[PDB]
Amino acid sequence: GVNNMENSAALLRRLNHYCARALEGAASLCQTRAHAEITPEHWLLKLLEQGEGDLTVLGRRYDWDMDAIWQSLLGWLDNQPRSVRSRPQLAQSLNALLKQAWMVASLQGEEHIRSVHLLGALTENPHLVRCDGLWPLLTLSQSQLQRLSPLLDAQSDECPETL
């Protein structure tokens, strides 16, 4: 009903501008391919496409083979079957990832969701993705991600706008 609808909408409003822009990009990509559901893989592809956020900073720091991650996401994208819809919806796994990322962020005292929170949610629930090439994203624990906040705040485009 109404309360559930408004809860899902409040969750979308909590996304920072980087993550929101990427989610819109994922929805646009789904529309061009006439796919019914926006998955976390569609979102991760668009996050990496923007390539200046928390994920890119971590990839650079920990020397992830970013090309192999991108190729795995392309492979996953091309292997997805068409599922007729004039307009896409968020997949069950995406609503779950969004909700868990907010819970990760809110437990840290944050008001907004950034890509590191989506990563934190993913590392604690690896089955939210069904793409083998995403294994580097599962290498850091939530405790490690939390400790990396000063580095992310110095290098990511998702950092605070003030000191």
Interface ranges with Br ion (CB under 5 A): 47, 53, 55-56
Cβ proximity to Br ion, 34 vs 74, nearer residue: 74
- Using left for φ > 0, alpha for ψ between -120 and 50, and beta otherwise, residue 83 falls in beta
CB of 50 to Br ion, least distance (A): 6
Helix pair angle (66-78, 54-61), 10° resolution: 130
| Residue number with CB closer to Br ion (5 or 154) | 154
The stretches of 33-107 forming alpha helices (DSSP H) are: 40-50, 54-61, 66-78, 92-107
Q: How far is the CB of 62 from Br ion (least distance, A)?
A: 13
Q: How far is CA 47 from CA 1, 56, 86, 114, 162, in A?
A: 31, 9, 24, 11, 23
Nearer to Br ion, 53 or 136 (CB): 53
For Br ion, give the closer residue by CB, 22 or 89.
Answer: 22
Closest CB 83 distance from Br ion, rounded Å: 27
The minimum distance between CB 84 and Br ion, in angstroms, equals 31
Nearest residue by C-beta to Br ion?
A: 53
Cβ neighbours of residue 27 closer than 8 Å, sequence gap 6 or more: 38, 88
